[PDB]
Amino acid sequence: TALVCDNGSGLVKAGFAGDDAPRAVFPSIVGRPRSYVGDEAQSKRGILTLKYPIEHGIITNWDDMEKIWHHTFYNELRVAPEEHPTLLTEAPLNPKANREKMTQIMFETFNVPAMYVAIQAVLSLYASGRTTGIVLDSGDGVTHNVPIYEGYALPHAIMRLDLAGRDLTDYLMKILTERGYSFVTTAEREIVRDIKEKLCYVALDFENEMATAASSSSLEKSYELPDGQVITIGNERFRCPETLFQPSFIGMESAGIHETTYNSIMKCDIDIRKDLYANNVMSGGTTMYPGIADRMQKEITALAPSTMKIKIIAPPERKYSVWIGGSILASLSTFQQMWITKQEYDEAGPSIVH
Numbered sequence: 001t002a003l004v005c006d007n008g009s010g011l012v013k014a015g016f017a018g019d020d021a022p023r024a025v026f027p028s029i030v031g032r033p034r035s036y037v038g039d040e041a042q043s044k045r046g047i048l049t050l051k052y053p054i055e056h057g058i059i060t061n062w063d064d065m066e067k068i069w070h071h072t073f074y075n076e077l078r079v080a081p082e083e084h085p086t087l088l089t090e091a092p093l094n095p096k097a098n099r100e101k102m103t104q105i106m107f108e109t110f111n112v113p114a115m116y117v118a119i120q121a122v123l124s125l126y127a128s129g130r131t132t133g134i135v136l137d138s139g140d141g142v143t144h145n146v147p148i149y150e151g152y153a154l155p156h157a158i159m160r161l162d163l164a165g166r167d168l169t170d171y172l173m174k175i176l177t178e179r180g181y182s183f184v185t186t187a188e189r190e191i192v193r194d195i196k197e198k199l200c201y202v203a204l205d206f207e208n209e210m211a212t213a214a215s216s217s218s219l220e221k222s223y224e225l226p227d228g229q230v231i232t233i234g235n236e237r238f239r240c241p242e243t244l245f246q247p248s249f250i251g252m253e254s255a256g257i258h259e260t261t262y263n264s265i266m267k268c269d270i271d272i273r274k275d276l277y278a279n280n281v282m283s284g285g286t287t288m289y290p291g292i293a294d295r296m297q298k299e300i301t302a303l304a305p306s307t308m309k310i311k312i313i314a315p316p317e318r319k320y321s322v323w324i325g326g327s328i329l330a331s332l333s334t335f336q337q338m339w340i341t342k343q344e345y346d347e348a349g350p351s352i353v354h
């Protein structure tokens, strides 16, 4: 049985090809004395320096990444890597040298029998059942617009916004102080992330939503805290994710996700634009907000030609679309020759991965 490992800036998603969802999901964090991995590392902040080996989707520290992979195989999945072909995912615009190092580590450190590396955005597109379209992938640390034509991600048109879930959680923590609530500790941040994932949503029209929240309490929702106290949240529910469309909310000069989507499409050949407009696919935990698809549909329509057919696809399981795409691909045993085997690695070296 093949294994699928999707390493993100904030979370590692791992499992067996064929499963409908990852069996293991843990924080992409490594702790080193002043080593531990995941929840275990976070728990020991202070006595351990924390390291996030994956920044903006790109691996930046190989020794820490090695620890993460070891943890995935031996502690989380509890499998013998030498017995399973392994599919790994990589961020858009990942340097070739990185792909080579990843391959060298899998064969020489973990001794896998075979492996394959796929681009995350492409896997998310496959998860929606298509090979052409533009993916909006927003996770914990980075957001990308990735146009894909017949399985090929067009590098020159990929857009990147260094704003994601982590920043949204921090922002919600900040604005919740306005109502007098104070969330500051690590434990408190965990509560805020839960509030964000349960009560936040994207307004179809921000200004009108603010007006509705100010003229009524129809948008207010209550939330019980660990101590038994109950708080009320109003416009904070939609102000938090609005940051995706208005990065200036958290002090970023970058254009919003709707604008980057449009700019991405305009960087592509005019003859395939129609296909991208009709196939806008959302992927990643930060695209889970109710209302985001309707908002993107409205914003893109405003930017696109009047006779352009616009369609946004937001799969219910998009929180794990990347992993799911990998599960699908890795489970196609008929194409087993696509796997890069150890033997092929011996004769051709790391460069065979490209």
Ligand SMILES: CN(C)C1=CCC2=C(c3ccc(N4C(=O)C=CC4=O)cc3C(=O)O)c3ccc(N(C)C)cc3OC2=C1
Residues within 6 Å of the ligand: 116, 118, 151, 329, 330, 331, 332, 333, 335, 336, 338, 339
């Ligand atoms: C199991 N495993 C590991 C695997 C890998 C891969 C694959 C692929 C392919 C094939 C080819 C290519 N390519 C490109 O792209 C370039 C060159 C080549 O070859 C790509 C691809 C993906 O990824 O999808 C594919 C395609 C198509 C299909 N169909 C059914 C129709 C399937 C598959 O499967 C697979 C599997």
Ligand SMILES: Nc1ncnc2c1ncn2[C@@H]1O[C@H](COP(=O)(O)OP(=O)(O)NP(=O)(O)O)[C@@H](O)[C@H]1O
Residues within 6 Å of the ligand: 007, 008, 009, 010, 011, 012, 056, 057, 138, 139, 140, 141, 142, 143, 164, 165, 166, 193, 196, 197, 198, 283, 284, 285, 286, 287, 288, 289, 319
């Ligand atoms: N229902 C939800 N509503 C809002 N945010 C959510 C929800 N579920 C998960 N998230 C956020 O999504 C992020 C996790 O998404 P994920 O796609 O796994 O990112 P990643 O792969 O770790 N990192 P990245 O490198 O940025 O793609 C966290 O910031 C979560 O809080």
Ligand SMILES: [Ca+2]
Residues within 6 Å of the ligand: 007, 008, 009, 120, 139, 284, 322
């Ligand atoms: Ca990701």
Ligand SMILES: [Ca+2]
Residues within 6 Å of the ligand: 251, 252, 253
């Ligand atoms: Ca600034």
Ligand SMILES: [Ca+2]
Residues within 6 Å of the ligand: 269, 270, 271
């Ligand atoms: Ca042309």
Ligand SMILES: [Ca+2]
Residues within 6 Å of the ligand: 336, 337, 338, 339, 340, 341, 344
């Ligand atoms: Ca092969």
